[PDB]
Amino acid sequence: PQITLWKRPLVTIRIAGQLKEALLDTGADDTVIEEMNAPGKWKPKMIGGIGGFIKVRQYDQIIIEIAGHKAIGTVLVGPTPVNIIGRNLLTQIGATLNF
Amino acid sequence: PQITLWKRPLVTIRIAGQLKEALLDTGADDTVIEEAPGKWKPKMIGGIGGFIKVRQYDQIIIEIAGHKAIGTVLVGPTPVNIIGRNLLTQIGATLNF
């Protein structure tokens, strides 16, 4: 798809069988999701955003379908204003900015 | 141009002759930069880690990667300068995959 930016670039993702809405976020290095049902082991991590730092659970090697395209990578689970798909997974699905 | 996302999508911007680097950010509703005169309205914007207080300037002419845009620029303690959707739309930016 070609996604214009008059509205928030929100898409449906599928992550461990669950459907969620997430924001395609070119300003995000990392992918941050509010909650997820992955059975794997995880590691505690901290990340900073515009407002300060948060604690997240780092899951590696998570399978996620982003608007039909498969990605397999790191997902951070913690408090975000909205689920964000960052560059670590945008690169995988072949996303570029074009103007 | 086409900008891949292997690295942070940073471009040069220019305000009133003043050069800065800024992130082309589809996740940001509005453009926010760290640096002053003119009329401005108080605003708060939030993301990971909470909210920051910013000054809202309207109808600012900015040049983004060589393309002129006119619109809202927020000014405040953002850790990175951010070109948001309000101005990305004006330079005809899309996300493609």
Ligand SMILES: CC(C)CN(C[C@@H](O)[C@H](Cc1ccccc1)NC(=O)O[C@H]1CO[C@H]2OCC[C@H]21)S(=O)(=O)c1ccc(N)cc1
């Ligand atoms: C979280 C989004 C819904 C909104 N953010 C835009 C976002 O692209 C920021 C933009 C950003 C970029 C760098 C530093 C702070 C904010 N990225 C971000 O928080 O990414 C985090 C996840 O990956 C990490 O990589 C960078 C920070 C971490 S935001 O910066 O808070 C923001 C919110 C409102 C406006 N108007 C402008 C910006």
